[model samples]
Target: AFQGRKLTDQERARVLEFQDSIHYSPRYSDDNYEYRHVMLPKAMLKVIPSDYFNSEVGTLRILTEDEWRGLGITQSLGWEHYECHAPEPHILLFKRPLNYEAELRAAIPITPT
Candidate 1:
């Protein structure tokens, strides 16, 4: 590490190549798979619009993948996963029906629970 100097263009290209190869690698492993979470000192969801949070702004409710699929939520609208606040993983979505709510609920019931 003592010999460290800024990387040269050719050396940088090689470094980029090493990273670029990983995305297309057919044998890549997900043993290193992980989820994203909030780590900043302040919660970041505050920047989102108020109504989407709930009848309550400044508050949040977590949803399961099952519940999200059941709710037919293709858009986050203005919500997100703040797993820093929970043991299990979760994400956020709006509550009111979006026309296809019943259909998705029918198709993807959280029946495993």
Candidate 2:
């Protein structure tokens, strides 16, 4: 699921630009992914996602393609390892269409590729 704050005009523009750059830049491979964790300043917390207030969790880590592979994770079968091995309290940022719970259920029988 896509999690994070609603960006300000400036932040939105900046993020979009960054996304575009990543999309067009050949330096990054077609399968490459870049994950960015954004924290709202204490002053800007009012504008961020509601989940921000849950102190039990801290930063969110958006996974890039390489990062996911480096962690030995495939799209369908990785959550278990992620939960057990990932540093605590770091929420994972996944793509919008990904149904994490459903994916996890489907992945139960599939071995990691």
Candidate 3:
């Protein structure tokens, strides 16, 4: 069996582009350690592996080479970050996937490297 694996180009692209919208902020002020909380697009929850995300208990995932490339492309497109808040301490906060049609403006050609 294919024990398990990583993300694909399209999947990675979705993940990175999604992360481009993430905005991080201090989760607590009085806490001894600084905690940064980020808001994620609910749609990306599907792009990423189910194992990587614990919707029941909010947690961040790690990045790999493929993820890094996807991130780079989003940044190349001039991605920006914004701030927001959530209710629970360890709850997954998701923003609706707006601007879904934005990608249609240009016919982006995905060429092999």
Please give me the total number of clashing residue pairs in predicted model 1.
Answer: 0
TM-score of 3: 0.39
Candidate 3 lDDT, 13-98, residue by residue in tens: 66776766655453432323223444455565556656554465454333332333343322222122212343433233222222
Q: Candidate 2, residues 1-113: lDDT per residue as tens digits?
A: 32334444664443333332221111111243332222222333233334433454453344344433333223333222122224333323333222333432333566678
What's the residue-level lDDT of 95 in candidate 2?
31
lDDT of 1 by residue, 1-113 (tens): 21223344554443333332221112212343223332211222332223324453344345444332222233333233332343321233123223322332345557575
Give TM per candidate: 0.19, 0.23, 0.39
> What's model 3's overall lDDT?
0.42
lDDT of each: 0.32, 0.33, 0.42
List residue ranges in candidate 2 displaced over 4 A: 1-4, 21-113
Compute the lDDT of residue 67 as modeled in candidate 2.
36
